Structure 1
Amino acid sequence: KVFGRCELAAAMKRHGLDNYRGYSLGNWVCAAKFESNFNTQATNRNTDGSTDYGILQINSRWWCNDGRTPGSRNLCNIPCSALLSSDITASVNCAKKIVSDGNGMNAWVAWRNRCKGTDVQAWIRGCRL
């Protein structure tokens, strides 16, 4: 599913991402924009053989099981395919664990390089929140 911007903001808010670990909702919408262009079916293969999945491009090296990343972890205890669903619950629950790891949202390369330090509230402007 390709979410509209406000549609994604509302789903992320409802699932408790807004201000999670101190990251305002605009940070999460911006991260999703540049990680997946709001497409839940986005995938990208990494050089090491792991794959990133879903709206927040969560990596199989640590966070989900895809059965094709030998020696990897599954810290969110989910199949990576669950991160491609139209329902973002699994992606949100897993992103909460990722952001709680020591580097916060710097875990998302696109957030660090394209969102961090910018006017992130503009990503939720106009939305009825």
Structure 2
Amino acid sequence: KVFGRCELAAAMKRHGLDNYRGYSLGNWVCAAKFESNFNTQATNRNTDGSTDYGILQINSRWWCNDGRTPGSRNLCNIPCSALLSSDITASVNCAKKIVSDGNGMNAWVAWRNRCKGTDVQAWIRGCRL
């Protein structure tokens, strides 16, 4: 599924991401936009044998099990395929563990490169939240 901008903002706010760990909703919407362009089916294979899954591109080497990532850990206790659903619940709950893993939102490279330090409030414009 491909979320509209405000549609996702609403979904994320509903799942408690607004200001979670001090990160405004705009930050998460911005991360989702540049990580997967709001596409729940987005996947990106990495050169280390791992793959990033879903709207928030969660990595298989440590967070989910796709059964084909060497020395992979499954800290979120879920199959990576669950991260490719139209329901973002799985990705949000896993994301909540990632942003609390000692690096803030820096865990998401697209967020760091395209969102960090910017006026992320713009990503929520026009949204009736």
Task: Determine the structure 1 residue equivalent to 2:76.
Answer: 76
Cα deviations by residue, 1:32-69 (Å, 9 ceiling, x for unpaired) = 00000000000000010000000000000100000000
- What is the distance in 1 between the residues matched to 2:69 and 2:86? 24
User: Gaps spanning 5+ residues in structure 2: where?
Assistant: none
Q: Which residue number corresponds to residue 99 of structure 2?
A: 99
Instruction: State the shift of 1:110 in Å.
Output: 0.3
Moved over 2 A (4+): none
SS in 2 for 1:49: coil
Counterparts in 2 of 1:1-129, with a 5 A limit? 1-129=1-129
Q: Distance in 2 between matches of 1:82 and 1:71?
A: 20
Paired with 1:46 and 1:74, the residues of 2 have a C-alpha distance of: 17
After superposition, give the CA deviation of every residue in 1:65-102 in whole Å (9 maximum; x if it has no partner): 00000211111100000000000000000000000010
**C-alpha distance in 2 between matches for 1:28 and 1:100:** 14
Q: Provide TM-score, normalisation by structure 2.
A: 0.99
Aligned residues: 129
- The alignment's C-alpha RMSD in Å is 0.4
Q: What SS is found at the alignment partner of 1:71?
A: coil
Which stretches in structure 1 are left out of the alignment for 5+ residues?
none
